[PDB]
Chains A and B, each alone.
Chain A
């Protein structure tokens, strides 16, 4: 063991290094305390001909452009064209980059969002990618908007509102800005839940290509399909879509990353109306007389918002009816009251 006696000096040098890094590692808190302003970063690869080529283009908030190479600590998610980065008074170095900005269905919604995050072990053991796009289509009456948003609130994760008129803006070019923004919060921030609705109305493919806004909504929408079919790593936040009609369905939605789990929900018959309406009345005071037969039959061509309005109208006259519990005939009274 005479040859292994030199290891003690190596360990003394290592512990001496750990004892001497406290100063230069301690000044990080007083030098890199807080960036007082915010500056935008745009990536631009340079070439010097070590003497290696590496630089970046900076843009301050005060509309002043300066020069600085790619510097800082070990970068993993950095080097992207983002904002809200670290900057000192005048050195203008990069130190800290930060991103700027219920009963009848519980299986398909909860699984499709948990398995691409928790079941990675079975993904590595089987080599199978999970489905991404789910299409809650079918005739109206199910209430996919209020029930799908309510179940998205029951997912206990982050929820981001995104509708039709949200992406469609008065100016041009903003659609891709809100797509890269929904991918900023969703893709860049924590995994959130985004539910859009009425995709069939904007998925119109006309023959006369002279006047159709829905084809610019197919430029932003098919640009999202470019950012899903073109971008293989779709393991992050998915795109959940739903339509109220099967009149004009986009044929280019046939992909695992795209809308694959197209679950057909038919007209809300006594069973389905008893399901979504048992959800709508699973907590309120329901008297032991609501057979749901006549009132579930009279709910024809009534969406979940209009059926919720029927529940409100049932919640209107029961005050003056004298009974503190909602009765059977008050549902059909609300139906015949709205229409």
Chain B
């Protein structure tokens, strides 16, 4: 009688305290709506550019529309950003200044036997890349007279202005008569913009190929590609490691042997082995089952891996 009223009142108090969470969560967004409505009150700002400064307090601005004006100095800002050469912003009323407006070393990994080192660059880039800047070898067609020097200086200039820069060159065998003159031009521009006062600590590039006879003996010279590593054995220990730490979320049959799948899928990379196991998952999802007999797994390994070996031209 008396002992049950505590549990019952605890239930009424429970269902009474479990209804506040359905409102106190959305009240923060509702108040954020009026916060934004109070944040949209700063309107009417324009831009400008500074070329010549006569007085330290008052300088000349250049608007984007074409007409030029002159503004003053606001009591809040200082003379740090007031120096010329920095794009600033202006206001429609009194032409005050609220704030400014900011404008906007080598490793070779080639394997004489087999192909797929571009997929090794996909393995390293899929492991830890953190810098997205890709350059394709099909942009140096040079069907014009030939002026890729400013393309190299402008590309690496955008690599200086853009801190994230990790490149992965690939398919260089088809671009490697005057067929070599452009290679000596672009490569000598690479030396001219890599051996001087260049930011080598920020730029990074990886060159890939497909054949051991077209290795570009100019690229084989030191300098351009200092760190050279052959691919004769595709890192069976690192392949097994990639399979172990990349075979987590994929569910397969209970009886699974990693050494057999590693040995039956070699030559290219361990991330390609991950593509073979995720391909076996792409067939197990077609067979609407989580775990299946390894016969279909051996069909993905033999048929898909050997299809990579045959169609890997």
Using CB atoms and an 8 Å cutoff, list the residues of chain A in contact with chain B: 1, 4, 7, 10, 14, 17, 21, 24-25, 44, 46-48, 55, 57, 63-69, 71-74, 90-93, 119, 122, 125-131, 205-213, 215-216, 218-219, 222-223, 226, 229-230, 249, 251-252, 254, 256, 262
Name the B residues within 8 Å of A252 (CB-CB): 118, 170-171
Partner of B34, one of A24, A68, A215, A216: A24
| B190 contacts the other chain (CB 8 A) | no
With both beta carbons as reference points, the residue of chain B lying nearest to A256 in the complex is identified as B275
Known contacts A64-B64, A131-B282; is A219 also within 8 Å of B141 by CB?
A: yes
Min CB–CB distance A51 → chain B (angstroms): 11
Question: Could you tell me if A66 and B47 are in contact, using CB atoms closer than 8 angstroms?
Answer: yes
Question: Could you tell me if B143 and A211 are in contact, using CB atoms closer than 8 angstroms?
Answer: yes
With both beta carbons as reference points, the residue of chain B lying nearest to A14 in the complex is identified as B23
**Cα distance A229–B122 in the bound complex, in angstroms:** 8
* Most chain B CB neighbours (cut-off 10 Å) among A44, A69, A131, A223: A69
Name the B residues within 8 Å of A223 (CB-CB): 136
Given contacts A71-B39, A90-B44, 5 further A-B contacts (CB under 8 A): A126-B281, A127-B249, A128-B281, A129-B278, A130-B285
Main secondary structure of the interface of A (DSSP, over half): loop
| B245 contacts the other chain (CB 8 A) | no
Question: Could you tell me if A66 and B46 are in contact, using CB atoms closer than 8 angstroms?
Answer: yes
Name the A residues within 8 Å of B281 (CB-CB): 126-128
**Cα distance A254–B210 in the bound complex, in angstroms:** 14
Question: Could you tell me if A216 and B138 are in contact, using CB atoms closer than 8 angstroms?
Answer: yes
Question: Could you tell me if A128 and B17 are in contact, using CB atoms closer than 8 angstroms?
Answer: no
Partner of A126, one of B33, B115, B140, B250: B250
The 0/1 profile, CB within 8 Å of A marked 1, for residues 151-173 of chain B is 00000000000000000001100
With both beta carbons as reference points, the residue of chain A lying nearest to B63 in the complex is identified as A65
Min CB–CB distance B276 → chain A (angstroms): 11
With both beta carbons as reference points, the residue of chain B lying nearest to A130 in the complex is identified as B282
Using CB atoms and an 8 Å cutoff, list the residues of chain B in contact with chain A: 9, 12-13, 16-17, 20, 23-24, 27, 29-30, 32-34, 36-37, 39-40, 42-47, 64-65, 89-90, 98-99, 101-102, 104, 115, 118-119, 122, 132, 134, 136, 138-143, 170-171, 174-175, 177-179, 182, 210, 249-251, 275, 278-279, 281-282, 284-285, 288, 290, 308, 311-313
Min CB–CB distance A288 → chain B (angstroms): 39
The 9 closest A-B pairs by CB, nearest first: A67-B45, A127-B249, A91-B43, A65-B64, A128-B281, A67-B89, A218-B138, A205-B174, A219-B138
Q: List 28 A-B contacts (CB under 8 A).
A: A24-B37, A44-B104, A63-B65, A67-B45, A68-B43, A90-B44, A91-B40, A92-B43, A92-B44, A119-B285, A122-B285, A127-B250, A128-B282, A128-B285, A206-B174, A208-B177, A208-B179, A209-B174, A210-B142, A210-B178, A219-B138, A222-B136, A226-B136, A251-B313, A254-B119, A254-B312, A256-B279, A262-B311
**Cα distance A216–B65 in the bound complex, in angstroms:** 36
Name the A residues within 8 Å of B170 (CB-CB): 252
Name the B residues within 8 Å of A73 (CB-CB): 33, 36
* Most chain B CB neighbours (cut-off 10 Å) among A14, A213, A256: A14
**Cα distance A72–B33 in the bound complex, in angstroms:** 9
**Cα distance A10–B24 in the bound complex, in angstroms:** 10
With both beta carbons as reference points, the residue of chain B lying nearest to A128 in the complex is identified as B281
**Cα distance A71–B35 in the bound complex, in angstroms:** 11
**Cα distance A251–B308 in the bound complex, in angstroms:** 10
Min CB–CB distance B168 → chain A (angstroms): 10
With both beta carbons as reference points, the residue of chain B lying nearest to A226 in the complex is identified as B134
Question: Could you tell me if A47 and B102 are in contact, using CB atoms closer than 8 angstroms?
Answer: yes
Known contacts A65-B64, A68-B43; is A207 also within 8 Å of B179 by CB?
A: yes
Min CB–CB distance B31 → chain A (angstroms): 8
Name the B residues within 8 Å of A48 (CB-CB): 99
Question: Could you tell me if A210 and B179 are in contact, using CB atoms closer than 8 angstroms?
Answer: yes
Name the B residues within 8 Å of A256 (CB-CB): 275, 278-279, 282
Name the B residues within 8 Å of A127 (CB-CB): 249-251, 281
**Cα distance A46–B42 in the bound complex, in angstroms:** 16
Question: Could you tell me if B136 and A7 are in contact, using CB atoms closer than 8 angstroms?
Answer: no
Name the B residues within 8 Å of A251 (CB-CB): 115, 210, 311-313
Name the A residues within 8 Å of B24 (CB-CB): 14
Name the A residues within 8 Å of B290 (CB-CB): 125-126
**Cα distance A112–B291 in the bound complex, in angstroms:** 22
Question: Could you tell me if A65 and B65 are in contact, using CB atoms closer than 8 angstroms?
Answer: yes
Question: Could you tell me if A254 and B311 are in contact, using CB atoms closer than 8 angstroms?
Answer: yes
Name the A residues within 8 Å of B282 (CB-CB): 128-131, 256
Min CB–CB distance A216 → chain B (angstroms): 6
Min CB–CB distance B80 → chain A (angstroms): 11
Name the A residues within 8 Å of B34 (CB-CB): 24
Known contacts A4-B13, A129-B278, A207-B179; is A10 also within 8 Å of B308 by CB?
A: no
Name the B residues within 8 Å of A7 (CB-CB): 16-17, 20
**Cα distance A71–B101 in the bound complex, in angstroms:** 16
Known contacts A25-B33, A46-B101, A254-B312; is A216 also within 8 Å of B141 by CB?
A: yes
With both beta carbons as reference points, the residue of chain A lying nearest to B118 in the complex is identified as A252
**Cα distance A46–B16 in the bound complex, in angstroms:** 47
